Amino acid sequence: ETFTVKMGADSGLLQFEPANVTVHPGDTVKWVNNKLPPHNILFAAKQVPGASKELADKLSHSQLMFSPGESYEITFSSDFPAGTYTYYCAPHRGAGMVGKITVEG
Ligand SMILES: [Cu+2]
Numbered sequence: 001e002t003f004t005v006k007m008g009a010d011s012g013l014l015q016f017e018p019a020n021v022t023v024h025p026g027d028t029v030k031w032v033n034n035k036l037p038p039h040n041i042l043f044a045a046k047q048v049p050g051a052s053k054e055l056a057d058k059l060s061h062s063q064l065m066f067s068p069g070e071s072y073e074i075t076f077s078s079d080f081p082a083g084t085y086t087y088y089c090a091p092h093r094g095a096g097m098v099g100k101i102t103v104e105g
Helices: 053-059
Strands: 002-007 020-023 028-033 039-043 061-065 071-075 083-088 098-103
Touching (some): 002 020, 028 039
Parallel strands (some): 002 028
Antiparallel strands (some): 028 071, 039 083
16 A cells, blocks of 8 residues: 655645654655645654664655655665654754654554
8 A cells, every 4th residue: 555645734734744654564655845845854763663864864864855756765675664753854853843754563
């Protein structure tokens, strides 16, 4: 299954929509620019399983995404452990543009 997460609400609010997604192994999450880019996707290394910098860095798209509808996707293969993964947008972290992926299993 593929879960689409909009970056930016239709109104311009700096939010991921939906902010919380639950996935199963093999599922994909696809972030897509919606309103008021640029956005990016940074996983907090203290807020992924094992507090792994490697894992957080692997999942992140640190490069700013400027283009309308620009997309980034992660397929959660077996090298992604069960647990919750919290991420944020660096441009809008202060404003609370934060999200969470829960990997079940
Ligand atoms: Cu943002």
